[PDB]
Write a protein that binds this ligand. Structure first.
Ligand SMILES: CCCCCCCCCCCCCCCCCC(=O)OC[C@H](COP(=O)([O-])OCC(O)COP(=O)([O-])OC[C@@H](COC(=O)CCCCCCCCCCCCCCCCC)OC(=O)CCCCCCCCCCCCCCCCC)OC(=O)CCCCCCCCCCCCCCCCC
Ligand SMILES: CCCCCCCCCCCCCCCCCC(=O)OC[C@H](COP(=O)([O-])OCC(O)COP(=O)([O-])OC[C@@H](COC(=O)CCCCCCCCCCCCCCCCC)OC(=O)CCCCCCCCCCCCCCCCC)OC(=O)CCCCCCCCCCCCCCCCC
Ligand SMILES: CCCCCCCCCCCCCCCCCC(=O)OC[C@H](COP(=O)([O-])OCC(O)COP(=O)([O-])OC[C@@H](COC(=O)CCCCCCCCCCCCCCCCC)OC(=O)CCCCCCCCCCCCCCCCC)OC(=O)CCCCCCCCCCCCCCCCC
Ligand SMILES: CCCCCCCCCCCCCCCCCC(=O)OC[C@H](COP(=O)([O-])OCC(O)COP(=O)([O-])OC[C@@H](COC(=O)CCCCCCCCCCCCCCCCC)OC(=O)CCCCCCCCCCCCCCCCC)OC(=O)CCCCCCCCCCCCCCCCC
Ligand SMILES: CCCCCCCCCCCCCCCCC[C@@H](O)O[C@H](CO[C@H](O)CCCCCCCCCCCCCCC)COP(=O)(O)OCC[N+](C)(C)C
Ligand SMILES: CCCCCCCCCCCCCCCCC[C@@H](O)O[C@H](CO[C@H](O)CCCCCCCCCCCCCCC)COP(=O)(O)OCC[N+](C)(C)C
Ligand SMILES: CCCCCCCC/C=C\CCCCCCCC(=O)OC[C@H](COP(=O)(O)OCCN)OC(=O)CCCCCCC/C=C\CCCCCCCC
Ligand SMILES: CCCCCCCC/C=C\CCCCCCCC(=O)O[C@H](COC(=O)CCCCCCC/C=C/CCCCCCCC)COP(=O)(O)OCCN
Lengths: 55, 69, 53, 121, 459, 56, 347, 98, 140
């Protein structure tokens, strides 16, 4: 219960699961430049109204 | 065994004092260098952190076809 | 980063065009030539940090 | 940043004239010996990659590797020492010219300072 | 102390230039000579260290560890040359190179005089061990074992690097002597609490603490015999050495901080000693034994009394020797029967008598029989804990009972009863194996003859 | 007989030569820390009329 | 392609980079970037196929948009101060525009999307060029104007780059995409220390370039573009795989290897400031890069994968053209940590 | 700042957004790029004309030259894409997805 | 922008739980709206209504998380008479994590979010008290 299940679950298995989920989310892109440049526009708009306003 | 392989305690004692002096000097020098870096970056009056400005040798001091320059 | 080849060789590849107070053809002056020369002279040699204040 | 702009500095010198007033690194300097070791390792890896007897294939090219690494390392060490000497010179001059920012505090003995005692129990 | 460091770097090319059938002989002979040379570090002073140069120094805490490392290399060479018989000469030289590099990094680690160099070598030890485990292991779990071993260590040790550079930026130095002489109390702050955690957690992971101890059974079970020997004997003691060194700066913060770690160490002492009672795998049983003993060492280091530190040093040395011997004994049976299940080969005392008495003496030293150094260290820690709190004796007492229980259970299961009928390939013990067992066990008794050599600087 | 046995067992001198070199390097290292030789408040001693250094 | 034309194009790329580095005028730096892009586009398309055309098109579009933003930032700076010299960047809006333009030229997150696709679509030589030489000019410009750089934006993009490189690299089987994601993470490490000390940025740049050159040259020596094609190399070139494994460990950042030195210096420089949390997160995130480097090392050197029968014929032939400096790059990429203080010759 | 400067900067922003948003044909994106060049040229010329800087009168010429270089580069790439697929649709440029 | 964070921080820790909850839900709504924008940009929803549905879902989840966090932290601070203590922020963070787990309808997500959000909020409070800087200004 403690070694083979819960101590495994908390530190290493949770870490592996979270990193795998984030890797799947980040990497799996459609490959289309339309979506990429839409993201670029969103990023530019955010930078201008956030970091820039507070000089 | 002591004569063939080892030395007296004076040698280790005085080597320890020499080493301690070197390390203490290095520590105070590191702290002083950090303080000097902070001061020069804050003020800009030191040799360090001197960002370039425009050279005044580029200015043309000649009559400019208009008296008011 | 910045390799100052011009300063080393004394070449003037692009410095002629950087400021308004620098040898325009036919001695035609910029609109703010006097202000720019005053700023450059005051600014010169003290470094960027000191210069702003 | 900090050392990029300094008064009286030639752009691409790599070794200013004022650096010759410093003691040159000895030819038996341990850092030079490590550079020669790096050259020997490069020669051995060159032999192994090209499928040649690693220790004995090319002696002239291994010698060239070792001497090239030592040759570059000597000037690298000279420039390293020069820049560290400049750092110390500038720091000492700045300390001397700004006395109010680096004041010598009063010397206290451990018989006078009261340090709190934390028992271990 | 380059008179020890340079002969190992010379072991390297001597191995790489030896002819194909003389590598083991040359390595063993010259490693034994190097250990004989390193034995001269035991002439320690009583008030300060042996400050050799600006970068290396030695006191009576690191000298026994250095001697243990230099002595352990020839034992690993002897144990390795059986399962590498079919191996090509180049990869045999590569294996010996891995062992030599591990020794060199360990030797420089125990004597590095400032914290950053110690950290660099402390983590450099990870590469040869990982290569050994994941290249010369036998089963398919060696890859995952190596991954666990690497990442558990690095996750706890990177914050140590951040804390070390912060400490040097604040105080100006990290040389141990300057750190000790210029030490100042830590305030009760959240920043100080997290700096304490960053300084302590790497060594907790290395010990290992009961919680973060999972990497250890995987690493020690999947590793080849020399890898297991070096992991159990020396590599676990890096955390103890690091704590005994880094703790001077931490106080007085340790008093209210050490509570969760003390509780984890004691209850996990009980838990991991209970686990050994139901272990069907021999190597896992020895690994969990190591976990419980190192939990005892963690308690000793945390409570920070002179008797605690003496007991911790004695226990570290004794456990290194005992665990190495136990792993070698298990590996002999493994090479006999090609399985690690405890109940497969039974009644081995009938067929291997001298190996049976080696098993008996190893089990006796494991359960801390007097007047072995194992019990000297354990009893010093127990007395220190009783001074810390009189209720610790219950937990300490329970642990002693379970330790004797599983040690004698392992001995009875493997050695006594009747031999399994089907196995007929149990050959008589070789001279190499008996010599290896003797070279583990004789130093333990010779050390209990003169116990002040492994009692640390507080002696 | 000497030639082949030497070419076979020249590797057995690397570790002893390494130890000798390490001893020499230790001597060279500790002759650089003489800034307090015969200057300690605890061991400051009058030099005998024939020697020149209290320790090497 | 004709060798003369290829040499001319490579020298035009290099001359554009040098023009960016040696110019004191904003217009000349812009011209250097444009010349670099103009000569760089055909090199990606040297071996013609639909994938190379896709990579060239995506790279061209991204770099052209970045050039647009860079010229707009220059013009706004000129409007608010009649200065053409690359300096403190007197206007903050122009500074934000310039920072995003240069970050998108570099591939820093959230502008990182183009890099994996372009690296995968081109050959290994063009990938080497793209991931080593094409980072110098934007980083030089960023170094020159680091005084006016905004810490909040630059550090955000650097942390995003480290996180995204680490995460995206975990999912990759192709080697070129792995190298691209590692490039993104290293770019983040480089730009995190930029507002504090540009010498550390240059040091990380040099170490990363050495390691990247070694890794691409090893992947070209053993003609492998996928994980399983590299799993075959041990049966033909075991020494190459061993050197690759040591180089991978160095790339991961484990001491006493060369790779550890740049992160060690950056962390020290950041902690000379207050800056405690961010280096901790950076190290814990570089753990991901180490993980997928170790996955590659497991597949290529520490285990032996099944081979094919036709490898026996390859056993009889030597590597025809040997790339020079491969041995030197490996040595500099592994055994250079003891020479760490020599970084003082960089400021 | 005058109001014509607002109009020119808004033109630049509109062209940048138009480039960022992709519909179908690649040609339209190149049109947006060339519009961004046009706006940059007009802004530079107005600033250069307003404060009498004589020596920068040539930089709009160089700007147009390198604008034409970008236009030629984009047209060559569009030719090759259309030859591969028969249309200049950006939806086809998705091979590097996997 | 950061004006939302000032309107959150200008309110004293243990006073006006309604205003603090409003500021917290504004911050949550802004974060969820940004996440929705990026998700729509990178992963199209195949129809306008499905896109607005995804945007509303993400924004509502984030706003509820923020509102619960702010309300719980303020109430805990004032009833216990112990401001300047990270335990209130930990309680608020676990409440927000439970809210997220309920929104996703999963017990495991709920427990993980409790633990991690509570730890993050406690660390943020400790950084506010001590003065830790996420983005330190260059000072050397
Ligand atoms: C800190 C202190 C110092 C340490 C520094 C670091 C280590 C030393 C320097 C390292 C670099 C130097 C050499 C590199 C190139 C060598 C490559 C090689 O393969 O060597 C083959 C070669 C033998 O081959 P051969 O004789 O030609 O014929 C057999 C075939 O070639 C056989 O060919 P093959 O095709 O059959 O080979 C196949 C094999 C071949 O695979 C390999 O051999 C591995 C190659 C090593 C990788 C090196 C990468 C760069 C170095 C980084 C080191 C990292 C150190 C940090 C710790 C982390 C460890 C990774 O691959 C495999 O089988 C797969 C095994 C997978 C294992 C994975 C682990 C590999 C990486 C471990 C590296 C650790 C360092 C090793 C150093 C020595 C290794 C030879 O080895 C040698 O003979 C050279 C050894 C050194 C010579 C010195 C002798 C000089 C004179 C002696 C006297 C000294 C002074 C005298 C004066 C005194 C007065 C009297
Ligand atoms: C004080 C500030 C407070 C904290 C702020 C900082 C923390 C922000 C937390 C946001 C975490 C990021 C990711 C969220 C979860 C993943 C996305 C998702 O699918 O969610 C669905 C997930 C469950 O839905 P599902 O259907 O099961 O998942 C679908 C599949 O699993 C798979 O779904 P998928 O495949 O459709 O994935 C979506 C898609 C799209 O990926 C995304 O969603 C992007 C999200 C990143 C935005 C980061 C937000 C930070 C905003 C800071 C400023 C706030 C202003 C105020 O993924 C991708 O395509 C690739 C992603 C990676 C590529 C690069 C994207 C990075 C862009 C750059 C990041 C931001 C740049 C900022 C400026 C840059 C200029 C230098 O969770 C949700 O329901 C959404 C709610 C998320 C929780 C938000 C927590 C807010 C707490 C606020 C409390 C305030 C209290 C008072 C404070 C004092
Ligand atoms: C100097 C530096 C500054 C430079 C930058 C300056 C920029 C400003 C000037 C720009 C002037 C515009 C002039 C021309 C623009 C060119 C447009 C174009 O070429 O269209 C191509 C593009 C491609 O279309 P297509 O390929 O030909 O047709 C196929 C279908 O479109 C697609 O096929 P499908 O039907 O199968 O797909 C499903 C459906 C899916 O449809 C959807 O999913 C969209 C539904 C999203 C719901 C929006 C949220 C609703 C509630 C929010 C409430 C806000 C706060 C209230 C309180 C909280 C409430 C809880 O369609 C979509 O996927 C479209 C999604 C993309 C939406 C538009 C992207 C804009 C940015 C991303 C916004 C994301 C919204 C999330 C929330 C954002 C924050 C509020 O057209 C579109 O994307 C459709 C809409 C275009 C019309 C409007 C364009 C104007 C937007 C300009 C910037 C936005 C405002 C900036 C103002 C800044 C202040 C000054
Ligand atoms: C370092 C050394 C070693 C340490 C490591 C080992 C120990 C730590 C790790 C192990 C425990 C941690 C695991 C976390 C929870 C895992 C849940 C999970 O994985 O979700 C997926 C999993 C399955 O996924 P699913 O498909 O979504 O659910 C389908 C179900 O199978 C279908 O289920 P159903 O339909 O049949 O019924 C579901 C429903 C119905 O519930 C049930 O079915 C049965 C009732 C279960 C929970 C209700 C409590 C009743 C018993 C407690 C009585 C007092 C206990 C003693 C405390 C006083 C001490 C004197 O559940 C509920 O509604 C329960 C709501 C939660 C209320 C409980 C509040 C407890 C707070 C703690 C207070 C005390 C703290 C200690 C202080 C001591 C100071 C001296 O969910 C579950 O089945 C578990 C739900 C029940 C929660 C159990 C957690 C309570 C244990 C204490 C946790 C505190 C430890 C960590 C602190 C931080 C946590 C916030
Ligand atoms: C793994 C290590 C990678 C090393 C990369 C290649 C190693 C060889 C380097 C090639 C040597 C030739 C380069 C220059 C020689 C003459 C040109 C001379 O003018 O350079 C001057 C000075 O020389 C160079 O600047 C320094 C080159 C030294 C490179 C070695 C340092 C490596 C970092 C530490 C790792 C240890 C490496 C040990 C050896 C392998 C430039 O001065 P300056 O115009 O004012 O600089 C402008 C840019 N600044 C101010 C921002 C810096
Ligand atoms: C699997 C094994 C893992 C290893 C386990 C390591 C354990 C590390 C725990 C460290 C123990 C001490 C940390 C906190 C110090 C004080 C304890 C806490 O209760 O503080 C109280 C304060 O009350 C509240 O508890 C404050 C803290 C609230 C936030 C903490 C909740 C964290 C939840 C536990 C998560 C589990 C840890 C593992 C994470 C992965 C004390 O009141 P006060 O005297 O005024 O403050 C003293 C500190 N001062 C002086 C600097 C201010
Ligand atoms: C901010 C973010 C911080 C990021 C922290 C990263 C910690 C470093 C560990 C990274 C491990 C990532 C593992 C992973 O993502 O993959 C899961 C992996 C997928 O298998 P593959 O080999 O990729 O596929 C083969 C089958 N087709 O699953 C596994 O098998 C896991 C095996 C090794 C896991 C090792 C994890 C050990 C974790 C120890 C604790 C340290 C965690 C770091 C943070 C410390 C906690 C605060
Ligand atoms: C096998 C897995 C083990 C993983 C353990 C790793 C975590 C170790 C514990 C925390 C490590 C990070 C500590 C940060 C480095 C210490 C430096 C320091 O203490 O200096 C403090 C800085 O203190 C901090 O900033 C600490 C910030 C912590 C952020 C990192 C979050 C890590 C996770 C936190 C909770 C988990 C830690 C314990 C988990 C134990 C393992 C289970 C003072 O700096 P100033 O800003 O100048 O403040 C005083 C001047 N006004």
């Amino acid at each position: 219960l403690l070694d083979l299940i819960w101590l495994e679950t908390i530190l290493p298995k949770t870490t592996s699961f979270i990193q795998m989920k984030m890797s799947i989310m980040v990497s799996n892109q459609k490959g289309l430049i339309k979506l990429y440049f839409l993201s670029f526009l969103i990023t530019i708009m955010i930078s201008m109204t956030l970091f820039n306003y507070h000089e | 065994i002591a004569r063939t392989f080892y030395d007296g305690p004076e040698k280790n004692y005085e080597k320890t004092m020499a080493i301690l002096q070197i390390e203490a000097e290095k520590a105070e020098l590191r702290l002083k260098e950090l303080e000097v870096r902070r001061l020069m970056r804050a003020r800009g009056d030191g040799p360090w952190y001197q960002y370039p400005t425009i050279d005044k040798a580029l200015i043309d001091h000649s009559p400019k076809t208009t008296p008011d320059n | 980063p910045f390799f100052d080849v011009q300063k080393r060789l004394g070449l003037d590849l692009d410095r002629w065009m950087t400021i308004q107070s620098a040898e325009q053809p036919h001695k035609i002056p910029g609109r703010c030539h006097a202000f720019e020369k005053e700023w450059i002279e005051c600014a010169h040699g003290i470094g960027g940090i000191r210069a702003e204040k | 940043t900090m050392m990029s702009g300094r008064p009286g500095r030639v752009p691409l010198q790599f070794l200013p004239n004022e650096a010759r007033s410093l003691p040159p690194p000895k030819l038996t300097d341990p850092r030079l010996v490590y550079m020669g070791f790096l050259g020997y390792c490069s020669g051995l890896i060159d032999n192994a990659i090209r499928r040649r007897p690693v220790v004995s294939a090319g002696l002239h090219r291994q010698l060239l590797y070792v001497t090239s690494f030592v040759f570059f390392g000597y000037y690298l060490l000279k420039r390293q020492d020069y820049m560290y000497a400049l750092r110390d010179h500038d720091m000492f001059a700045y300390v001397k010219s700004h006395p109010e920012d680096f004041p010598e505090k009063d010397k206290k003995t451990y018989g006078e300072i009261l340090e709190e005692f934390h028992p271990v129990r | 102390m380059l008179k020890i460091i340079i002969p190992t770097t010379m072991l390297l090319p001597m191995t790489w230039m030896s002819k194909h059938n003389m590598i083991w002989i040359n390595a063993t002979v010259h490693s034994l000579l190097i250990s004989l040379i390193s034995l001269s570090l035991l002439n320690q002073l009583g008030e300060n260290s042996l400050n050799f140069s600006l970068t290396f120094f030695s006191d009576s805490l690191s000298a026994p560890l250095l001697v243990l490392t230099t002595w352990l290399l020839p034992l690993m060479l002897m144990a390795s040359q059986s399962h590498l018989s079919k191996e090509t000469t180049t990869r045999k030289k590569l294996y010996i190179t891995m062992l030599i590099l591990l020794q060199l990094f360990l030797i420089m680690t125990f004597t590095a005089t400032e914290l950053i160099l110690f950290y660099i070598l402390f983590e450099a030890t990870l590469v040869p061990t990982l290569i050994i485990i994941t290249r010369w292991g036998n089963q398919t779990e060696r890859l995952n074992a190596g991954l666990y071993f690497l990442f558990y260590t690095l996750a706890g040790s990177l914050p140590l690097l951040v804390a070390l550079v912060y400490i040097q930026n604040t105080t100006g130095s990290l040389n141990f002597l300057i750190i000790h002489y210029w030490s100042h109390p830590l305030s009760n702050s959240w920043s100080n609490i997290f700096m304490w955690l960053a300084c302590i957690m790497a060594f907790m992971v290395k010990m290992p603490l009961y919680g973060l101890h999972l990497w250890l059974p995987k690493a020690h079970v999947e590793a080849p015999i020399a890898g297991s020997m070096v992991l159990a004997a020396v590599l676990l003691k890096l955390g103890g050495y690091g704590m005994m060194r880094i703790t001077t700066i931490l106080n007085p913060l340790t008093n209210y901080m050490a509570y969760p770690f003390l509780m984890l160490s004691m209850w996990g002492m009980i838990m991991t000693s209970s686990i050994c009672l139901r272990q069907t795998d021999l190597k896992s049983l020895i690994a969990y034994s190591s976990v419980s003993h190192m939990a005892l060492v963690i308690v000793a280091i945390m409570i920070q009394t002179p008797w605690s530190f003496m007991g911790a040093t004695a226990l570290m040395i004794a456990h290194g020797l005992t665990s190495s011997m136990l792993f070698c004994l298990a590996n002999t049976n493994y090479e006999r029967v090609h399985s690690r299940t405890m109940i497969l080969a039974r009644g081995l005392q009938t067929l291997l008598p001298l190996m049976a008495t080696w098993w008996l003496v190893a089990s006796l030293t494991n359960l801390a029989l007097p007047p072995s150094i194992n019990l000297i260290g354990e009893l010093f820690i127990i007395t220190a804990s009783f001074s810390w709190s009189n209720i610790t004796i219950i937990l300490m007492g329970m642990n002693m009972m379970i330790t004797a229980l599983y040690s004698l259970y392992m001995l009875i299961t493997t050695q006594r009863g009747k031999y399994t009928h089907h196995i007929n390939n149990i050959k008589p013990s070789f001279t190499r194996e008996n010599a290896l067992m003797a070279l583990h066990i004789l130093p333990l008794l010779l050390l209990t003859l003169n116990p002040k050599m492994i009692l640390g600087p507080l002696y | 007989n000497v030639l082949q046995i030497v070419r076979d067992h020249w590797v057995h001198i690397l570790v002893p030569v390494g130890f000798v070199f390490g001893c020499y390097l230790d001597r060279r290292s500790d002759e650089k820390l003489t800034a307090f030789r015969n200057k300690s408040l605890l061991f400051k001693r009058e030099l005998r009329p024939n020697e020149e250094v209290t320790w090497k | 392609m004709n060798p003369i034309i290829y040499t001319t194009l490579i020298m035009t790329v290099m001359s554009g980079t040098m023009l960016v580095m040696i110019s004191s005028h904003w217009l000349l730096i812009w011209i250097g970037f444009e010349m670099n892009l103009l000569a760089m586009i055909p090199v990606l398309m040297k071996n013609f196929n639909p994938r190379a055309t896709e990579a060239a098109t995506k790279y061209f579009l991204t770099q052209a948009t970045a050039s647009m933003m860079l010229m707009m930032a220059i013009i706004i700076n000129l409007l608010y101060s009649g200065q053409w010299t690359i300096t403190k960047m007197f206007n903050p809006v122009a500074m934000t525009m310039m920072t995003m333009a240069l970050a998108m030229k570099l591939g820093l997150s959230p502008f990182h999307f183009w890099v994996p696709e372009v690296t995968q679509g081109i050959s290994l030589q063009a990938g080497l060029l793209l991931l080593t030489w094409q980072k110098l000019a934007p980083l030089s410009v960023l170094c020159q104007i680091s005084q006016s750089i905004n810490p909040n934006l630059m550090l955000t993009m650097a942390m995003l780059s480290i996180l995204i490189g680490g995460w995206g690299g975990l999912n990759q089987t192709q080697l070129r995409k792995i190298m691209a994601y590692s490039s993104i993470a290293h770019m983040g490490w480089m730009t995190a220390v930029l507002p504090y000390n540009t010498t550390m940025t240059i040091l990380n740049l040099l170490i990363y370039i050495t390691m990247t050159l070694a890794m691409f040259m090893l992947l070209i020596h053993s003609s492998a573009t996928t994980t399983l094609s590299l799993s075959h190399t041990w049966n033909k070139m075991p020494v190459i795989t061993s050197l690759m494994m040591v180089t991978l460990l160095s790339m991961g950042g484990l001491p006493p290897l060369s790779g550890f030195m740049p992160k060690w210096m950056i962390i020290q420089e950041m902690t000379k400031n207050e800056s405690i949390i961010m280096p901790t997160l950076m190290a814990m995130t570089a753990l991901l890069n180490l993980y997928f480097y170790m996955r590659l090392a497991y597949s290529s050197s520490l285990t032996m994968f099944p081979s094919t029968n036709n490898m026996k014929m390859k056993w009889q032939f030597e590597h025809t053209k040997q790339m020079k400096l491969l041995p030197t790059m490996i040595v500099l990429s592994t055994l250079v940590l003891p020479m760490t203080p020599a970084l003082s010759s960089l400021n | 700042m005058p109001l014509v400067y607002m109009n020119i900067i808004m033109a630049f922003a509109i062209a940048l957004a138009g480039l960022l948003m992709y519909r179908s044909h690649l040609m339209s994106s190149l049109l947006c790029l060339e519009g961004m060049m046009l706006s940059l040229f007009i802004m530079s010329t107005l600033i250069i004309l307003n404060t009498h800087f004589t020596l920068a009168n040539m930089m709009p010429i160089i700007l147009l030259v390198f604008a034409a270089c970008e236009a030629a580069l984009g047209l060559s790439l569009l030719v090759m894409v259309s030859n591969t697929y028969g249309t200049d649709y950006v939806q086809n440029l998705n091979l590097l997805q996997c | 922008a950061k004006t939302l964070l000032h309107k959150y921080s200008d309110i004293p820790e243990g006073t006006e739980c309604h205003r603090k909850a409003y500021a917290s839900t504004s911050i949550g709504g802004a974060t969820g709206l940004i996440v929705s924008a990026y998700s729509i940009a990178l992963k199209p929803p195949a129809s306008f209504l499905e896109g607005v549905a995804r945007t509303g879902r993400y924004t509502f989840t984030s706003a509820a998380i923020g509102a619960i966090f702010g309300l719980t932290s303020c109430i805990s601070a004032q009833v216990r008479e112990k401001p300047d203590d990270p335990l209130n922020y930990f309680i608020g963070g676990c409440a927000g994590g439970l809210t997220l787990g309920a929104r996703t309808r999963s017990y495991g997500i709920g427990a993980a979010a409790c633990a991690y959000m509570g730890l993050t909020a406690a660390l943020v409070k400790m950084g506010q008290l001590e003065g830790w800087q996420v983005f330190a200004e260059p000072k050397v």
